[PDB]
């Protein structure tokens, strides 16, 4: 129909330190937030970053849209930063060799975080409270004036973004 991106109006807390530190989550959230994605969220994160006095940045994001669910994304790297590297430059080759066999095996995926975003109903149906229809009507209702978006971490409460043209 049309094409127009709104702007962020305000952010509300929807997380807790019962699952993880908001500081760390904010660090990653900021890494991706500043990574760009919203016509304001980036400036919001970058702004908070400037006010935080931390230019943190070194995470690997991986957004994706899921049907009959909503939106989602993953971020991992804090692990790599936690544990320095050791010259990540291998040379895989030579197989036909009579009896070579290169010692290339064993891999323990690092800690990866998944953040899901979408309508409150999505999160509700994901594994929250309140009725999906109730929350759905609420979220949709808001769309009749403003834009409401809920952000959950690993299907857990984290925070929601409120957009107001």
Curated annotation (Swiss-Prot):
PTM remark: Isoform 1 may be proteolytically cleaved at the N-terminus to produce the WND/140 kDa form.
Q: Tell me what effect the entry lists for residue 142 to G.
A: In WD; yeast complementation assays show that the variant fully rescue iron-uptake deficiency of yeast mutant ccc2
Variant or mutagenesis effect after changing residue 33 to K: In WD; loss of copper transport activity; loss of ATPase activity
Query: What does the UniProt record report as the effect of altering residue 10 to W in this chain?
Result: In WD; uncertain significance; no effect on copper transport activity
Mutagenesis / variant outcome for changing residue 75 to I: In WD; uncertain significance
Q: What outcome is documented for mutating residue 75 to D in this protein?
A: In WD; marked impairment in copper transport
What is the residue range of the signal peptide feature?
Answer: none
Effect the entry attributes to changing residue 118 to E: In WD; uncertain significance
The protein's location, in the record's own words, is: Golgi apparatus, trans-Golgi network membrane; Late endosome
Substitution effect: residue 120 to C: In WD; yeast complementation assays show that the variant does not rescue iron-uptake deficiency of yeast mutant ccc2
The reported result of mutating residue 147 to A is:
In WD; uncertain significance
Swapping residue 71 to T leads to an effect described as: In WD; yeast complementation assays show that the variant intermediately rescue iron-uptake deficiency of yeast mutant ccc2
Effect recorded for residue 145 to E: In WD; yeast complementation assays show that the variant mildly rescue iron-uptake deficiency of yeast mutant ccc2
Q: What is the effect of changing residue 70 to R?
A: In WD; yeast complementation assays show that the variant does not rescue iron-uptake deficiency of yeast mutant ccc2
> Tissue-wise, where is it found?
Most abundant in liver and kidney and also found in brain. Isoform 2 is expressed in brain but not in liver. The cleaved form WND/140 kDa is found in liver cell lines and other tissues.
Its biological purpose is as follows: Copper ion transmembrane transporter involved in the export of copper out of the cells. It is involved in copper homeostasis in the liver, where it ensures the efflux of copper from hepatocytes into the bile in response to copper overload.
The text the record gives for the protein's domains is: Each HMA domain can bind a copper ion, they are tightly packed and closely interact with each other. Wild-type ATP7B can usually be loaded with an average 5.5 copper atoms per molecule.
Summarize the disease involvement recorded for this protein: Wilson disease: An autosomal recessive disorder of copper metabolism in which copper cannot be incorporated into ceruloplasmin in liver, and cannot be excreted from the liver into the bile. Copper accumulates in the liver and subsequently in the brain and kidney. The disease is characterized by neurologic manifestations and signs of cirrhosis.
| Subunit organization | Monomer. Interacts with COMMD1/MURR1. Interacts with DCTN4, in a copper-dependent manner. Interacts with ATOX1. Interacts (via C-terminus) with ZBTB16/PLZF.
Q: Which family does it belong to?
A: Belongs to the cation transport ATPase (P-type) (TC 3.A.3) family. Type IB subfamily.
Q: What is this protein called?
A: Copper-transporting ATPase 2
């Amino acid at each position: 129909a049309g094409h127009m991106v709104p702007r962020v109006m305000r952010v509300l807390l929807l997380g807790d330190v019962a699952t993880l530190p908001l500081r760390k989550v904010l660090a990653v959230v900021g890494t991706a937030e500043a990574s760009s994605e919203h016509p304001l969220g980036v400036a919001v994160t970058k702004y908070c970053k400037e006010e935080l006095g931390t230019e943190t940045l070194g995470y690997c994001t991986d957004f994706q849209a899921v049907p009959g669910c909503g939106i989602g994304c993953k971020v991992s790297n804090v692990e790599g930063i936690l544990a320095h590297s050791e010259r990540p430059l291998s040379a895989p080759a030579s197989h036909l060799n009579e009896a070579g066999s290169l010692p290339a095996e064993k891999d323990a995926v690092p800690q990866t975080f998944s953040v899901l975003i979408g309508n409150r109903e999505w999160l509700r149906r994901n594994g929250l409270t309140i009725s999906s229809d109730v929350s759905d009507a609420m979220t949709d209702h808001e769309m009749k004036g403003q834009t409401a978006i809920l952000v959950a971490i690993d299907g857990v409460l984290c925070g929601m973004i409120a957009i107001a043209d």
